[PDB]
Write a protein that binds this DNA or RNA. Structure first.
Ligand SMILES: [K+]
Ligand SMILES: [K+]
Ligand SMILES: [K+]
Ligand SMILES: [K+]
Ligand SMILES: [K+]
Ligand SMILES: [K+]
Ligand SMILES: [K+]
Ligand SMILES: [K+]
Ligand SMILES: [K+]
Ligand SMILES: [Mg+2]
Ligand SMILES: [Mg+2]
Ligand SMILES: [Mg+2]
Ligand SMILES: [Mg+2]
Ligand SMILES: [Mg+2]
Ligand SMILES: [Mg+2]
Ligand SMILES: [Mg+2]
Ligand SMILES: [Mg+2]
Ligand SMILES: [Mg+2]
Ligand SMILES: [Mg+2]
Ligand SMILES: [Mg+2]
Ligand SMILES: [Mg+2]
Ligand SMILES: [Mg+2]
Ligand SMILES: [Mg+2]
Ligand SMILES: [Mg+2]
Ligand SMILES: [Mg+2]
Ligand SMILES: [Mg+2]
Ligand SMILES: [Mg+2]
Ligand SMILES: [Mg+2]
Ligand SMILES: [Mg+2]
Ligand SMILES: [Mg+2]
Ligand SMILES: [Mg+2]
Ligand SMILES: [Mg+2]
Ligand SMILES: [Mg+2]
Ligand SMILES: [Mg+2]
Ligand SMILES: [Mg+2]
Ligand SMILES: [Mg+2]
Ligand SMILES: [Mg+2]
Ligand SMILES: [Mg+2]
Ligand SMILES: [Mg+2]
Ligand SMILES: [Mg+2]
Ligand SMILES: [Mg+2]
Ligand SMILES: [Mg+2]
Ligand SMILES: [Mg+2]
Ligand SMILES: [Mg+2]
Ligand SMILES: [Mg+2]
Ligand SMILES: [Mg+2]
Ligand SMILES: [Mg+2]
Ligand SMILES: [Mg+2]
Ligand SMILES: [Mg+2]
Ligand SMILES: [Mg+2]
Ligand SMILES: [Mg+2]
Ligand SMILES: [Mg+2]
Ligand SMILES: [Mg+2]
Ligand SMILES: [Mg+2]
Ligand SMILES: [Mg+2]
Ligand SMILES: [Mg+2]
Ligand SMILES: [Mg+2]
Ligand SMILES: [Mg+2]
Ligand SMILES: [Mg+2]
Ligand SMILES: [Mg+2]
Ligand SMILES: [Mg+2]
Ligand SMILES: [Mg+2]
Ligand SMILES: [Mg+2]
Ligand SMILES: [Mg+2]
Ligand SMILES: [Mg+2]
Ligand SMILES: [Mg+2]
Ligand SMILES: [Mg+2]
Ligand SMILES: [Mg+2]
Ligand SMILES: [Mg+2]
Ligand SMILES: [Mg+2]
Ligand SMILES: [Mg+2]
Ligand SMILES: [Mg+2]
Ligand SMILES: [Mg+2]
Ligand SMILES: [Mg+2]
Lengths: 123, 56, 118, 114, 209, 14
RNA sequence: GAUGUCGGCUCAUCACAUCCUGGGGCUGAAGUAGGUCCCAAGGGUAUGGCUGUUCGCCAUUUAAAGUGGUACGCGAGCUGGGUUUAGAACGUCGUGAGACAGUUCGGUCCCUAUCUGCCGUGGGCGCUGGAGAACUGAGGGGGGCUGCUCCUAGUACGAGAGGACCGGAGUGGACGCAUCACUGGUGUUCGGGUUGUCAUGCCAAUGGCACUGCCCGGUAGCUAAAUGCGGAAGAGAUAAGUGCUGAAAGCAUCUAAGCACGAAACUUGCCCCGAGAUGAGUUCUCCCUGACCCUUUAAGGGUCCUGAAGGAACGUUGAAGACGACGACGUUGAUAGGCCGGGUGUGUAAGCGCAGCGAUGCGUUGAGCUAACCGGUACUAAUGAACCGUGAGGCUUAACCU
RNA sequence: AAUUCCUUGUCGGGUAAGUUCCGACCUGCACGAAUGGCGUAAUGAUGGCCAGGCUGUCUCCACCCGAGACUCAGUGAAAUU
RNA sequence: CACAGGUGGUCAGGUAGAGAAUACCAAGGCGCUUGAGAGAACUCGGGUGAAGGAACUAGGCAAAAUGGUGCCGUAACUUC
RNA sequence: AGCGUCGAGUCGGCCUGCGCGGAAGAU
RNA sequence: AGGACCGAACCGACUAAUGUUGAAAAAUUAGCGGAUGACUUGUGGCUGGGGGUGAAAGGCCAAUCAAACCGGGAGAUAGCU
């Protein structure tokens, strides 16, 4: 449940540390983005030497949310923070080579198989 | 907001046509005492359905 | 909307309602018959009869619960000494409501609420 | 009432172990990842139990990879395979939501010996 | 074709072998007894009148008692009608069970929605509330403007305002038939249906499916 | 906002 | 002898000179993507930074972010940032008081709705004996949006790059209707922790107050952020357009005689209201089968007897409700309260015993308490009655039976 | 610039995006030295801009507690015409 | 006006508290001259709220938030 | 006119009466 | 010691909401400023209308102020309604 102005933490070694959602992509008047939804983000904080720099406009996919995801049986998996993985603006592929923290099965798609493989745990 | 013209006694009576009161349809009679009373209400003397429920 | 809800506000807040019902329960236990407005009697039915059900069994814990709910040692003693044994066989209907017309100062529907064994 | 009671009691598991909030439990769930079907283990402290019969659920909190994850399992759901109580905890509340702001020595729960 | 009249029992869940939980509504559809069959000659159209349930003898009025006596069936809690499709015929006194939906995949459920009473514009028509601060004066959930300064100089018919909400006939279409328990006279359908517990529902085969 | 005599606000066209 | 203005918010409504979706002609139209013109108003038709701004520029989206009218729609619906009172200052003008299509700081927005209009809900009478139900449908309203992926197919086309039409599935955004099974919110009517103080003689245990004193959880109900469903398929008649046959005009020609197609536009099909539809409709069932007297002697009045079906009234009430209205019951009774059992929530009550100098811990004990929940129970309250409502229901003309 | 019409002057910083803000340039329509010029610590219910925390200000509202609104009994106005 | 306004001096209990603040009480005084019901929209005064956190707005208006004592520690600038 | 053939009219210009298109707006 | 600091009484009135036929012809609630001084307050006295007083707003001078109120000139005058 990520809208505009929402701050997220990066779950990859792309150099960023904190990003802000500036647009929820995927339709007109679309309000929220859950796990597995591409968003347009800007970089607020970054490590001194990394692949990305502060003030860059990129795309990202949300991997963890406090709202959580719901399973067909009615189960819900809630995390303690909102995390996303930075993606290339054109190819929409991960920038870093590592993923920090667990992810969910909602990313089990042909597009994010790299994230699934690099993730430590998939719960 | 206020009226632009004075309403008539005809309109006043038409509005008041729904203000008529309704009288009581019937009054129950106690079996033991025989006094008239409202249904499901005790009598003035203190009787209800042939029993002196209260004193006076 | 008040679907499937119980309890009369009676134009009062919770503390005033609780204090008024405590006083009215004490008066009803003391006098075995009281005259009051019909909604007040209907709401009293739901707080006086559980007190007699509690007083049916005599114990220190029950006496302390009755004291916490009534704040009158005379009322607690009467409940656990007379009303308890009197209603020991009876289950449920310890009170009766008799509608007695309307009040004079205001057109308030009045009624008498008493004990069935009186 | 009786109809729904029968319809729900004809679907309830009879092998559910007895656990209390503050107890460490491990739950086996069917991943069904791709064609294969395997069992995944989720171990953590129970912080909330909702006892509504067939609609019963329980919340388990686990610190995984430096991130706190809370998962709510339906007790009678077929996806849940087994629940095992690894450790018993001593708490005085039905809900342990205060553990969401504690980590490390502050999140420790005394064991219920007897 | 024709449908059946049942009672809403409540909502529950069904767990499938693959872990999916289906929210279902329990509908108690007992035997419906045919009281009158209408034809194109006497009535001008083809439909069947049915009754279900039981009613107190001291409250069944004499005209209704005579109608049920002519029908030959026991008095129920009401009377409903279903139009007959071509090639469909029923006899007076015939009993129809929940087995009619044995092969039906999707149904339409008609009921009376729960009454909200007098509701405001925000609740009834999803109107946006005005600002709660920044100087707003006694205008928070008010509708706002309802017309134009002139031309037409009036309010149009059908203007969205406050009024009675709910307590009206509502139909939900294309609900999956989860289960048809003939022994218990039960129909389990996926989703939610209008009304509260104990309300009368009319379940028909889907028309848009 | 200026208030004229007779307690009426001065909202005249200018 | 007064028609409140710019912008913003809420709520809209109409036109088509159409932004997207839809259907076609031409193309300097190979395909994809375009340009122009014609038809088409059913639906839809962004969020932010700056600025009082409309506008505009910029960032990022979308199928699209249309153009206009409606007192440049809308202040007896809100705001008051701008422009227009009184204060003060800068630049400039004047000797000055003072003044600038100049900037800057600050600066009271009243109205209980009579009529029309609109949103809901009732009373009266009528519909031609009265009453209880179920319907038909003249008419009216609601809804109609669209993205992406896959198959056909890397096929048609194309030197390559690139890349289809038609057709068929899946999954989304926005909107709308329901509902509380799940996930949550609330839950001052349930349980517990705790601070200060007062009181019940005192210890213990409780209660009042301090925002529910502060909090921690939480039943039912309501509810969204939660989960079910929907936009249709089909039919008829057509717009632009495309045709067959065919003369006027031996040819030609979609047309003048005929015939076949043709769109989210129209009428249906889907949902809801609906016989005050005074043109007041249809079907089923139930009830009333006395006497006498006057007359201005007829659709007349009066008296005695009779009071049916049904309704109204009263009481207990509802997931019905502002009040009416609507629904379930009234002893041949589960309508409400209480009571019993269970469930839920909270969390191991009080008393007693033991250990410790004590705070405190342990056992009895998952104890005690437990609202609106579930299944039962006639203990309490739903009284016998009385009231309204009648006694076979007009004339004429036809068709049958007699 | 409390002064600049052109003007949202030009460059830089801050923001994804800044007609406001800050630092400069000087092309000062129309600054300027007691109707004082330029600085200035502290002070200000003073004007403008930014950041952390905070939140129903908002996305987008939901529920609850009270006082009216609603019904009953009593008393009983006003503008306007 | 039997009107949420204004009006000088004097007295100064207990517990907690720095205190004449504040909360609860004592002596003393009072429940404020219409009541009774129900628990719609809407208005007023409040409580709570998932995820986000100024995206609202002319403007963080209003709300929310901080808040005591003791100790450690505290920058540019400065008229010290 | 049609494809030498063909077997009754044909080709246009002028003046005129009445007609058609050009012709889209907001309750 | 301080026209020193925080903060009650006391003195003011910066913001918002309510009210605006009000409880009130300027108030209530929640916040807000000063609070040993150029402070505040009780009683009595003085300054009178082209005059008074004014840390200056054309502010105040009995709910009235770019010339108070009362009586008179006076039935001012009104090419206006
Ligand atoms: K359109
Ligand atoms: K007007
Ligand atoms: K709930
Ligand atoms: K104990
Ligand atoms: K200048
Ligand atoms: K100087
Ligand atoms: K100041
Ligand atoms: K102060
Ligand atoms: K003078
Ligand atoms: Mg009246
Ligand atoms: Mg109830
Ligand atoms: Mg009242
Ligand atoms: Mg209290
Ligand atoms: Mg309702
Ligand atoms: Mg809004
Ligand atoms: Mg106001
Ligand atoms: Mg307000
Ligand atoms: Mg207006
Ligand atoms: Mg006039
Ligand atoms: Mg057109
Ligand atoms: Mg259509
Ligand atoms: Mg803009
Ligand atoms: Mg900003
Ligand atoms: Mg206008
Ligand atoms: Mg317009
Ligand atoms: Mg305006
Ligand atoms: Mg202004
Ligand atoms: Mg001035
Ligand atoms: Mg106003
Ligand atoms: Mg009128
Ligand atoms: Mg429509
Ligand atoms: Mg729920
Ligand atoms: Mg439930
Ligand atoms: Mg409680
Ligand atoms: Mg003690
Ligand atoms: Mg007290
Ligand atoms: Mg007190
Ligand atoms: Mg709580
Ligand atoms: Mg909860
Ligand atoms: Mg031809
Ligand atoms: Mg042809
Ligand atoms: Mg049309
Ligand atoms: Mg019962
Ligand atoms: Mg206790
Ligand atoms: Mg228990
Ligand atoms: Mg710049
Ligand atoms: Mg100067
Ligand atoms: Mg100076
Ligand atoms: Mg009255
Ligand atoms: Mg008084
Ligand atoms: Mg007073
Ligand atoms: Mg004083
Ligand atoms: Mg005090
Ligand atoms: Mg209320
Ligand atoms: Mg409020
Ligand atoms: Mg709050
Ligand atoms: Mg929140
Ligand atoms: Mg939160
Ligand atoms: Mg934050
Ligand atoms: Mg903004
Ligand atoms: Mg904005
Ligand atoms: Mg503020
Ligand atoms: Mg506050
Ligand atoms: Mg013409
Ligand atoms: Mg000082
Ligand atoms: Mg002021
Ligand atoms: Mg104050
Ligand atoms: Mg100070
Ligand atoms: Mg101070
Ligand atoms: Mg001046
Ligand atoms: Mg004065
Ligand atoms: Mg003069
Ligand atoms: Mg003279
Ligand atoms: Mg004169």
């Amino acid at each position: 449940m990520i809208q505009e102005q929402t701050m997220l933490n990066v779950a990859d070694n792309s150099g960023a540390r904190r990003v802000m959602c500036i647009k929820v992509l995927g339709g007109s008047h679309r309000r929220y983005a859950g796990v597995g939804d591409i968003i347009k983000i800007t970089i607020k904080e970054a490590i001194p030497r990394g692949k990305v720099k502060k003030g860059d406009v990129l795309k990202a996919v949300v991997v963890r949310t406090k709202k959580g995801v719901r399973r067909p049986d009615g189960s819900v998996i809630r995390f303690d923070g909102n995390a996303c993985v930075l993606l290339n603006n054109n190819s929409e592929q991960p920038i870093g080579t590592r993923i920090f923290g667990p992810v969910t099965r909602e990313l089990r798609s042909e597009k994010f198989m790299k994230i699934i493989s690099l993730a430590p745990e998939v719960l | 907001a206020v009226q632009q013209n004075k309403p008539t006694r005809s309109k006043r009576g038409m509005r008041r046509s729904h203000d008529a009161l309704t009288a009581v349809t019937s009054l129950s009679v106690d079996k033991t005492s025989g006094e008239k009373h409202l249904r499901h209400h005790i009598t003035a003397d203190g009787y209800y359905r042939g029993r002196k429920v209260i004193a006076k | 909307m008040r679907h499937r809800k119980s309890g009369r506000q009676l134009n009062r807040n919770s503390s005033h309602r609780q204090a008024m019902f405590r006083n009215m329960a004490g008066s009803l236990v003391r006098h075995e018959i009281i005259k009051t407005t019909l909604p007040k009697a209907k709401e009293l039915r739901r707080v006086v009869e559980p007190l007699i059900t509690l007083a049916k069994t005599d114990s220190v814990a029950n006496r302390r619960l009755a004291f916490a709910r009534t704040r009158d040692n005379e009322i607690v003693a009467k409940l656990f000494n007379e009303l308890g044994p009197r209603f020991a066989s009876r289950a449920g209907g310890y009170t009766r409501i008799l509608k007695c017309g309307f009040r004079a100062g205001d057109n308030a529907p009045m009624a008498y609420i008493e004990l069935v064994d009186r | 009432s009786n109809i729904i009671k029968q319809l729900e009691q004809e679907q309830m598991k009879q092998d559910v172990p007895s656990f209390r909030p503050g107890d460490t439990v491990e739950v086996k769930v069917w991943v069904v990842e791709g064609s294969k079907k395997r069992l995944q283990a989720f171990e953590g402290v129970v912080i909330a139990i909702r006892n509504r019969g067939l609609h019963s659920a329980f919340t388990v909190r686990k610190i995984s990879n430096g991130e706190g994850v809370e998962r709510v399992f339906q007790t009678h759901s077929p996806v849940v395979d087994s629940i095992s109580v690894k450790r018993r905890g001593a708490v005085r509340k039905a809900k342990l939501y205060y553990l969401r702001e504690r980590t490390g020595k502050a999140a420790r729960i005394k064991e219920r010996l007897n | 074709m024709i449908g059946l009249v049942g009672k809403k029992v409540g909502m529950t869940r069904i767990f499938t072998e693959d872990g999916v939980s289906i929210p279902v509504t329990v509908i108690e559809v007992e035997a419906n007894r045919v009281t009158q069959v209408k034809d194109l000659a006497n009535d001008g159209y083809r439909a069947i009148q049915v009754t279900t349930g039981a009613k107190k003898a001291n409250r069944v009025t004499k005209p209704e008692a005579g109608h049920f006596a002519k029908a030959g069936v026991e008095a129920g809690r009401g009377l409903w009608e279903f139009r007959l499709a071509e090639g469909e015929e029923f006899t007076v006194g015939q009993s129809i069970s929940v087995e009619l939906f044995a092969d039906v995949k999707k149904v339409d459920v008609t009921g009376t929605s729960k009454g909200k009473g007098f509701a405001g514009t925000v609740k009834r028509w999803n109107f946006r509330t005005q600002d709660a601060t920044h100087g707003n004066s006694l205008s928070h959930r008010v509708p706002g403007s309802i017309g134009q300064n002139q031309t037409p100089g009036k309010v149009f018919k059908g203007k969205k305002m406050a009024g009675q909400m709910g307590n009206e006939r509502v139909t939900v279409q294309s609900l999956d038939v989860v289960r048809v328990d003939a022994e218990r006279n039960l129909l389990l359908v996926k989703g939610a249906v209008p009304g509260a517990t104990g309300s009368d529902l009319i379940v028909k085969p889907a028309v848009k499916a | 906002m200026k208030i004229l005599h007779s307690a009426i606000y001065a909202t005249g066209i200018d």
